[PDB]
Symmetry: C3
Subunit: 274 residues, 3 copies
Amino acid sequence: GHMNAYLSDQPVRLSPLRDEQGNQPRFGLLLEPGRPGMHVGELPAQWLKGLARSHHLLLLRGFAAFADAESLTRYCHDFGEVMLWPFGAVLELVEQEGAEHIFANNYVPLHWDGMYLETVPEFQVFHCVDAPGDSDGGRTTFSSTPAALQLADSSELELWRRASGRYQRSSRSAAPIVERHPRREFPILRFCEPPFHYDGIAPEQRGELLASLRRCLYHPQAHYAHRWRSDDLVIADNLTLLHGREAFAHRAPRHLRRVHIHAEPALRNPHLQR
Amino acid sequence: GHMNAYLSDQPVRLSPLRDEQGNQPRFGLLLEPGRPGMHVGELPAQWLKGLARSHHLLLLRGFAAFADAESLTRYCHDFGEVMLWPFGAVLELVEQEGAEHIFANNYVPLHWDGMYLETVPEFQVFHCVDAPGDSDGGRTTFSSTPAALQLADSSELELWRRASGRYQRSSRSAAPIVERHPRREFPILRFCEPPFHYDGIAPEQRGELLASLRRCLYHPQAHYAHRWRSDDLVIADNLTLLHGREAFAHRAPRHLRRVHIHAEPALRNPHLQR
Amino acid sequence: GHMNAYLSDQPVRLSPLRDEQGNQPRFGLLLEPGRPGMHVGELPAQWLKGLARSHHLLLLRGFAAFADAESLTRYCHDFGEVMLWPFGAVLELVEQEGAEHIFANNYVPLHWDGMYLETVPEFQVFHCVDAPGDSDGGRTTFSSTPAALQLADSSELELWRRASGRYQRSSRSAAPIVERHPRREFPILRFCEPPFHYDGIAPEQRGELLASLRRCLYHPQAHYAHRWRSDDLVIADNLTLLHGREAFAHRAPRHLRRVHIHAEPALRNPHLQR
């Protein structure tokens, strides 16, 4: 059980985001339609963008949504400045039941989008085209870095503040662990989690940096695992959150589509090694 | 009787729009001043625009409003990009008591603004300069096309989906009956009602197209008839609604002023025959 | 005691602004953090700007705020178009305990920012860096000119409407006492109070103009005196309010920082004598 504190002037029902077990982290907002048959496009994108910036993760659930990738794309061009890839606006993310090429990892550690790019998108917009039946594990995960910062104790925090991450894949990227939001100034974390060099601390302290970061980022106050449903529309603040993916035993059938939206104006990657 | 679900962070009182007989359609919002003497300009235009996009029809009632057409015009230039006519920003709509030139129609069927124009305005802004005494009939009418779409049965809907309208006045314009919102993607209707050719269906089906469209567009869930009061300010979503005018027996004295606001950015008419 | 009518869709607690004695004028809004450790930057600037325009004075209290003038500056550049001075973005306003150069005035009469400038800022953004211990008098004051207009009686109002102010410091500036908001049209006052010539009325009426303006501008319905606390962030609508400063006996230690934000787009000063 929990209480609901939101009353909107928009034709929607708002409530705190909670995962399927009822845990309520310190971010996220659930939006549901205020009229029969309401489509996501009926809400003003400028308003949604405001909510995404303060709540960091929006889940629009139960709305009629986009008939195809083209419709989603046109919507996103109205929503903001789409960050285009060689493939266009929409990344297709399709998984088949029990599929699995044996060289992958069983999961995706926490990171942010655009780490190795010339420009960093402010938002991820995910449309769940289809999510039939239920899966075991495999949920998309999100962590609020400001929440993690509130969980850290004095010594954990002191360690984080002197640490820097160096990442390579060739593209290279480096960021202090503790950052400022690149437009809005508030404290955030930028961390790419190992399944990777960490400077500014002693090598003997690497183990403790990772443990403490993980304790706080995966804490129930800071972490949310999303179980997709058909026609969910999720808008994530990529400048504040880190995201990843929960381990799975039985991969379920699922179709997601992702579009990136530029910051205003477009954000030059401050961490890319040029 | 009815319930009121809106609490704003703006200094205003919000409630569901209801016509004078108490019918509450599936759109529309009433705004009333939160302070003695409040003027419409005290509210932020960006916020009003958001509400107009999701509620489709705003009625601001009981506010102090504009002293003259010039004041309204300056306000509208701040509000958004005014769509200018040869006469300037403001169309004067003045009617005299019991006036009536015998070649007109007794009413105005449902249609949208900009049908025959190079660009289509997103909003109509109406200021009621004066509406003394009460009239009989003659109310300005508005229909929510998404509401009408929710009322259609399987067979009505199938018919609508194959139908196209061809309109002439010389300027010509053609639009599918069932459209997508030109910026925000959700399903709408574009229909100019006869007091006119309809393609894609069999001629024997014309009668049923018109009957079913009328049943749904004039349904109490989808239709609102506005009784003007002095200093009302009405903002209508021309991209989602259709509008017209109720038949009158005794034309009452009334002065309205209308300004068109461009879409963002200006919307090239997709239906104009060039 | 008083009632609280605001429920936001933002992660904040809203309530009517009240001074330290519990007087609640006809403007102003108090915002407080909705999460432990929340920083002012977590809220969307576009939303804050909307609230500032309708409530005229926002007090964000209890938020984590800016570590230094540079951080405040970057935030303000995201917030809107900063009006830059030769010193940059931030005016430092530092006072020492019991300090006081014997040629000053004991207080600051009501006026507006930008009177003698080529362009007039829409907003003042004040960050209280530090306000240790409590002061006696010396509070920053704000008056809502629309509230003052609602307090005026028939004869006071008639006098105001024919009066004009002429100000000199060389730079010269002239404005009708009763103005229209330069973007949003609603009635406001533009008045620079004497601790100064007033045209359009008879010299014998100067005394009554000043008395009546003061009665209404300093009335509890129209006037708010702010007691600063560390990390307050205040955003004031300079186009609607007048501001000044309460007399002090014992100047307390205090550090404020002020940034000006241009109107959208920048507002050419309509009252500057060129």
